[PDB]
Subunit: 145 residues, 3 copies
């Protein structure tokens, strides 16, 4: 269709414009096909999950070095640790994404994880490395869409 | 078309991402197919209408309990009354949306409306109930898109 | 396609909603098919170019009176001059857009340009008129998408 082609072009341009504005003003960070954003609040794991789902997204989880660096830049920006989208398996030391799949990419701080099963959550330090920790602390809420 | 399907999927995802960011940061509230947002300014009815149309929208008007609660949450958030998108008919006590249609859903504070035709505008209290009032007061500008 | 028509309508509405929110909150200004926005930072020409490209856009450049007035309103809003997307040719007095094409629309302050080739950049005063100037000053970063 000849009109369909032009309509799609305009639609794609408008999306580029809206995403460009959000990017320019630091409202979000786009990495590949993933968009990260924070509301600036520091709350516990359960609360963060609720906030993200309310917005139509999920708690952020890095699956590549580039995504990890992006979340880390936000942690650094707000000078606060970030809870990530993963929880410990029944077997201590093993973690899984919230959908149940086993974690692949990892960036544990040397020595971590070592909570012996008592720290089922994972927090990201400002340098981007990870630490298994309890889930009741107040951490920066970072979501992915 | 095989490429049209993938293009639309990506377009829809990007929209979800941009709307998710705006939602997460409290820049807007989505209720069904309607989006509410405020610039935080408190001005009169005529001014609000101009501001909304300038942005490509219209003065907010709740047509369902869910929409009413959404606008109320914004009123509460900014601790200020909100002018709604309706004005009094020639017959006192009867109101109409700006397009001329008679108002259906209402949420008048007990006793309202009772301006006897001297208060053609409608303001929303922070608890979400309505009050007919003059149109020259300074009220939170809430628009719908 | 009967479903394609409805899908496009919804997509276009969502775009209108997201753009309406950004417009209402002063996050951007739309003029025709062009969107202008600033991150509020004041840096040199090279830095501005980087910031804009990072966001998926380019340094703003007015090509019509309407676009010029839009950028001027932003300069006025932030009370700071704005570097524009153009640089001087090898021949003093002649300027070109960054893609190499010769500038068409101009709005030089009376007497400008007169840097004799020593001021290859162009800054916009808050009244919207232009002045050729060095490229190392700190100016409001305004991008176009
Ligand atoms: Ca640990
Ligand atoms: Ca009354
Ligand atoms: Ca000069």
């Amino acid at each position: 269709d000849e009109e369909l082609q032009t309509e799609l072009y305009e639609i794609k341009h408008q999306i580029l414009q809206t995403m460009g504005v959000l990017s320019l003003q630091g409202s979000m960070l786009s990495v590949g096909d993933k968009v990260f954003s924070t509301n600036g609040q520091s709350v516990n794991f359960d609360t963060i999950k609720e906030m993200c789902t309310r917005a139509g997204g999920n708690i952020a989880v890095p699956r590549t070095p580039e995504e990890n660096e992006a979340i880390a830049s936000i942690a650094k920006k707000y000078n606060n640790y970030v809870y990530l989208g993963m929880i410990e398996d029944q077997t201590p030391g093993d973690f899984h994404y919230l959908d149940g799949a086993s974690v692949s990419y990892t960036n544990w701080y040397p020595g971590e994880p070592r909570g012996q099963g008592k720290e089922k959550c994972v927090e990201m330090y400002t340098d981007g490395t990870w630490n298994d920790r309890g889930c009741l602390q107040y951490r920066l809420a970072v979501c992915e869409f």
